Design a protein around this ligand. Structure first.
Ligand SMILES: NC1=NC(=O)c2cc(Cl)ccc21
Ligand SMILES: [Cl-]
Ligand SMILES: [Cl-]
Ligand SMILES: [Mg+2]
Ligand SMILES: [Mg+2]
Lengths: 142, 128
């Protein structure tokens, strides 16, 4: 998947498509907009292809990662979702939304201690008061 | 992948990893790089294999290449902020001090590794 592609690219250290500016920013923006068009209409499989395409071209992009992670979470591919959410967090640093969703994923993976660690991070560090309430509700059930 | 089918016994992979760090510790960077690339081809999902290849790229002053692998390494481990610390070092070398500050601050705010936080704070103290 997307993470494997990123690691293979890093191993090979040959020229990538982004290295030669093969697809301009405005064009990537358009494709991202089509990806969400598909997603918003329930065409999840088509959206997944488009987000995978975007992540092959520019893996280290929070918006593309988050779109793909959401698809995996909806498809109950919870480990794949959690891994991508953590990449998004590492790149973005100040949005705890990916940490919250990783906590949801860890609960479904039967890892409540990992989920508790996620939800506690949201409470301790997020300034999103509504997200903190949501995180607390999961903590209350654990 | 090769790991998915147990293509090489576990103890032999342990040996190859230990030989890779032996090369690294002895300054045989080109040979360490072959061995860490081999390991990451065998199992891209192994955080310590990725960290070893990232260390090679950092020592070779391929700082963005290292930082990219550190972001994957962070995700695979979820709660180990060592890759975030090293990303902070790479960002300083890339002349991105605000990004580096964000990395070191993330280590101090989330890590439970006291020795790592001490190191991260020493970098924050030096950043203008
Ligand atoms: N420190 C952390 N423990 C976790 O389980 C986790 C998940 C994510 Cl997404 C970011 C950071 C962390
Ligand atoms: Cl993958
Ligand atoms: Cl999965
Ligand atoms: Mg490259
Ligand atoms: Mg607060």
């Amino acid at each position: 998947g997307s993470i494997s592609t990123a690691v293979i690219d890093a191993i090979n250290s040959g020229a990538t498509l982004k290295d030669i500016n093969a697809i301009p920013d405005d064009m990537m923006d358009d494709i991202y907009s089509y990806a969400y068009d598909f997603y918003n209409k329930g065409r999840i499989e088509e959206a997944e292809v488009f987000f995978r395409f975007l992540c092959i071209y520019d893996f280290y992009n929070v918006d593309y990662i988050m779109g793909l992670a959401a698809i995996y979470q909806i498809k109950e591919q919870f480990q794949q979702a959690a891994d991508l959410y953590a990449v998004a967090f590492a790149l973005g640093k100040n949005d705890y939304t990916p940490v919250f969703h990783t906590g949801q994923c860890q609960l479904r993976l039967k890892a409540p201690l990992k989920a508790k660690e996620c939800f506690e991070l949201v409470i301790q560090h997020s300034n999103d008061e509504k997200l903190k309430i949501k995180a607390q509700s999961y903590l209350d059930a654990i």
